[PDB]
Design a protein around this ligand. Structure first.
Ligand SMILES: */C=C/C(=O)Nc1cccc(Oc2nc(Nc3ccc(N4CCN(C)CC4)cc3OC)ncc2Cl)c1
Length: 310
């Protein structure tokens, strides 16, 4: 707002990195797991390279530069950062690898060892991430568990910016002509009016909590995307996760408030899960909670968040 944005965009020649394997593939493009080796510095930084499908229009292409723009410019522990971009005919964005994949996946793999302290911390981190975006006047528009990456099980980050939009000083809303959207994560207004606001994200934040508390369950499983709005109006809502006390579920519920301004706010959500964080057991009941807490896996390739700073 006042401060100059000295976020640095580095540009990398495609020969600076190599692609080992592919994690994700989509019409949108392909994202590879690979290594980045800046010349001279000898280090190998594990990264995810997202190679994007050829730009059909200038507009499509222009939005690719927007994504990178926000992503390079955003620094917070809990949001992903662009490491660098590469301007081949099909651009590639280089990002730090999240060695564990997307939380969505993680919870499904270890429900057995997932414990209360973890789930609440995750919430807090996700809420911190999101709050930061609110601070920067950005609307994510795609929060979901799939969209949360796991750096280390103890640490997570918000990941997807394909749909992120930055807001005008005079703007408290974003309106979208069209696209492809994940309905079951959307606030009724967005589905009804393609109106997006930080509060529409909060709704998502909640579907995201539900995902995590039900260890990977699908929102409105069996129900088709078509009527999500119907039932949403009629008052239906995702049920209480078996693990959840009313206190925690009650927060998921407020998120799904129809009135946008009756929904919690990220800064609040932070403090509240932060509070439940200290005495996790009291709020989330997990059975046996007391119980719980590339080419080569390592090759003189210690890197990433560490390379950038002291
Ligand atoms: C679960 C959501 C998802 O699919 N996430 C995802 C898929 C592909 C690519 C990226 O980008 C990305 N990924 C990572 N780390 C990462 C992501 C995904 C995985 N997977 C997902 C697919 N299963 C089959 C294999 C493991 C693994 C990852 O680390 C290896 N880091 C950064 C980025 Cl941008 C996300």
């Amino acid at each position: 707002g006042e401060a100059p944005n000295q976020a640095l965009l580095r540009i990398l020649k495609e020969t600076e990195f190599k692609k080992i394997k592919v994690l994700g593939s989509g019409a949108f493009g392909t994202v590879y797991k690979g290594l980045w080796i800046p010349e001279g510095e000898k280090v190998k930084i594990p990264v995810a390279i997202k190679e994007l499908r050829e730009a059909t229009s200038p507009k499509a292409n222009k939005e690719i530069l927007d994504e990178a723009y926000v992503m390079a410019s955003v620094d917070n522990p809990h949001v992903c950062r662009l490491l660098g971009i590469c301007l081949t005919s099909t651009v590639q964005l280089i990002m730090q690898l999240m060695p564990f994949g997307c939380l969505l996946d993680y919870v499904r793999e270890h429900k057995d060892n997932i414990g209360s302290q973890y789930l609440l911390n995750w919430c807090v981190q996700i809420a911190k991430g999101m709050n930061y975006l609110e601070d920067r006047r950005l609307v994510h528009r795609d929060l979901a568990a799939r969209n949360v990456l796991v750096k280390t099980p103890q640490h997570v980050k918000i990941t997807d910016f394909g749909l992120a939009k930055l807001l005008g000083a005079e703007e408290k809303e974003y309106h979208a002509e069209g696209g492809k959207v994940p309905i079951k994560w959307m606030a009724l207004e967005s589905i009804l009016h393609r109106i997006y606001t930080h509060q529409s994200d909060v709704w998502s934040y909640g579907v995201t909590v539900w995902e995590l508390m039900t260890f990977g369950s699908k929102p409105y499983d069996g129900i088709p995307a078509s009527e999500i709005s119907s039932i949403l109006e009629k008052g239906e809502r995702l049920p209480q996760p078996p693990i959840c006390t009313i206190d925690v579920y009650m927060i998921m519920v407020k998120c799904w408030m129809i009135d946008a301004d009756s929904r919690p706010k990220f800064r609040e959500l932070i403090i509240e899960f932060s509070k439940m964080a200290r005495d996790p057991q009291r709020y989330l009941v997990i059975q046996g909670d007391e119980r719980m807490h590339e080419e080569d896996m390592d090759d003189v390739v210690d890197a990433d968040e560490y390379l950038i700073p002291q």
